[PDB]
């Protein structure tokens, strides 16, 4: 008894879609972030913020639509619909890029709601909350890339825009301006992602190829019962196989599954730290000893100096259209180009 | 250097086979973390708080070391019941197939842009 | 002095030694170029 | 090459300090009663 406990009862009913206290935050914010993205990519332009078409209505396809960031002149304005920029005018708000902060902010609070959901359900079911803990890596990435990075830069304009090709542009921007591939925090991110994909594949394949024969079918999926006490595959045979193939093997299933969390979660967290550095242009851009040698010795060449020439091409060729607020006019005689091309 | 020149000459980012590759490795990393966290979340209590829980599993023991019904009961409520695997064999086949197929396609992306059929 | 009942022995098994040395050495192989710059 | 003059000791202590930590802990585990 008590309205709070009565409400708690209803929120936690076992139903097709669990709600919970966390659902009061999660469902409106997630629905609005997704609905905002679908609305913007279907109907909303980026003509006034970027000089770009970005919706199905204008002729884009699924790969090129986006909800694009606001103009650089907006700074880091929250760009609330009722705020001083749009002043309650829904049409102007869309034209000013208000859907970008709408999606970014409702998305942020929705991710909070989702991780609270992971905690809430784990507590109700009686399991340890490692799934929520693992989800801290997606959150670290989202916050570092969509909030901290632009907050360190001049404006939201330089955050990623919410679109397939828009994100590809973000990747190449980070190469040309930040030399982000050179960054050891990104490199640790890559190791954790590819290492996680490796662990996913090798563990799934190992279980499926050390199965015990627990039925007569040549299709082996039916020969498992969720309530059975026995392991469905042989850890002993799996351990000998990998010991003889690779030299080492798991022997402890609990360590194995913790390691499958540890590797990708740690990798994403490391990539987030590097992006926090890039918010301040605190790049791993150069090796000073390389530059001193190359400056004095015009026969000295490495793949490192080759990639910087590519970066210099990216910046000069992409900046005038990618940064329209700068009003760059680069006479073609100043554009960096190799021979013929 | 190879990646940058490849993008200049083939627009690999706009090629659906590389996009499948990304889905393969992002998804593989996601599913590694998901599977790791769900099994770890439902380890059966066999140790005290001053012991690593890893000592609760003994190499070659016959009994399973976590409660997959508990794990499915969690994950099925996180999303909805029928989005969650209750069959460990189906689950581990999915863990194998998703990254492997994604990497097959991204390898085929490089191997077909090798003949200059390029991204959109 | 009377002994502290909260003391506990500490352990690092051999696999953890190998894993930790691998982490440290590979992290060193990775960051050393940037330390030399 | 004109590298950072502290790069050598930075790398050396980066390896040695945590490696030694682990070796101390490992060896005193082995010496515990079995």
């Amino acid at each position: 008894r008590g309205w709070f406990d009565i409400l708690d009862d209803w929120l936690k009913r076992d139903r097709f879609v669990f709600v919970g206290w966390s659902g009061i935050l999660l469902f409106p914010c997630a629905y609005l972030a997704l609905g905002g993205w679908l609305t913007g990519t279907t109907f909303v332009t980026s003509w006034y913020t970027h000089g770009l078409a970005s919706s199905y209505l204008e002729g884009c396809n699924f790969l090129t639509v986006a909800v694009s960031t606001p103009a650089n002149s907006m700074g880091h304005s929250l760009l609330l619909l009722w705020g001083p920029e749009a002043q309650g005018d829904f049409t102007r708000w869309c034209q000013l890029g208000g859907l970008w902060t709408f999606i970014a902010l409702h998305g942020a609070f929705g991710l909070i709601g989702f991780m609270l959901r992971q905690f809430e359900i784990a507590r109700l079911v009686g399991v340890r909350p490692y799934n929520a803990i693992a989800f801290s890596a997606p959150i670290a990435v989202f916050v570092s890339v969509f909030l901290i990075y632009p907050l360190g830069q001049s404006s939201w304009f330089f955050a990623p825009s919410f679109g397939v090709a828009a994100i590809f542009r973000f990747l190449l921007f980070f190469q040309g301006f930040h030399n982000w591939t050179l960054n050891p925090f990104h490199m640790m991110g890559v190791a954790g992602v590819l290492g996680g994909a490796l662990l996913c594949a090798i563990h799934g394949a190992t279980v499926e190829n050390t199965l015990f024969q627990d039925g007569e079918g040549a299709s082996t999926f039916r020969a498992f019962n969720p309530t059975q006490a026995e392991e469905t595959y042989s850890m002993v045979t799996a351990n000998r196989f990998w010991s003889q193939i690779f030299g080492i093997a798991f022997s402890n299933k609990r360590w194995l599954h913790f390691f499958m969390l540890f590797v990708p979660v740690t990798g994403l967290w490391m990539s987030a730290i590097g992006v926090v550095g890039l918010a301040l242009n605190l790049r791993s851009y150069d090796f000073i000893s390389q530059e001193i040698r190359a400056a004095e010795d015009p026969e000295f060449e490495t793949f490192y100096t080759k990639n910087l020439l590519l970066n210099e091409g990216i910046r000069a060729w992409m900046a005038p259209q990618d940064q329209p607020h700068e009003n760059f006019v680069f006479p073609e005689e100043v554009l960096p180009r190799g021979n013929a091309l | 250097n190879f990646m940058l020149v490849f993008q200049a000459e083939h627009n690999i980012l706009m090629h659906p086979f590389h996009q499948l590759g990304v889905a393969g490795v992002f998804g593989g990393a996601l599913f590694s973390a998901m599977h790791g966290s769900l099994v770890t979340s439902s380890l059966i209590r066999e140790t005290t708080e001053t012991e690593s829980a890893n000592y609760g599993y003994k190499f070659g023991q016959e009994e399973e070391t976590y409660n997959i019904v508990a794990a499915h009961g969690y994950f099925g409520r996180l999303i909805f019941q029928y989005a969650s695997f209750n069959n460990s064999r189906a689950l581990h086949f999915f863990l194998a197939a998703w990254p492997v197929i994604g990497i097959w396609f991204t390898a085929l992306g490089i191997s077909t842009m090798a003949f200059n059929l390029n991204g959109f | 002095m009377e002994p502290n009942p909260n003391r506990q022995p500490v352990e690092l098994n051999r696999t953890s030694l190998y894993l930790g040395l691998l982490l440290i050495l590979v992290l060193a192989l990775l960051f050393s170029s940037y330390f030399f710059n | 090459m004109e590298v950072n003059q502290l790069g050598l000791i930075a790398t050396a202590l980066f390896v040695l300090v945590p490696s030694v930590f682990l070796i101390i802990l490992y060896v005193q585990t082995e010496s515990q009663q079995k």
């Binding site: 080492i248 093997a249 | 023991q61 | 691998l22 192989l29 050393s32 | 050598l8």
Partner: peptide
């Protein structure tokens, strides 16, 4: 000095591989 450092770390890793394979804790069924 830098080259010595890089090769030294690499050589330690190769040595570590050797001990981790041939002087591992043997897996034991209990």
């Amino acid at each position: 000095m830098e080259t010595i450092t890089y090769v030294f770390i690499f050589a330690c890793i190769i040595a570590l591989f050797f001990f981790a394979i041939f002087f591992r804790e043997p897996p034991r069924i209990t």
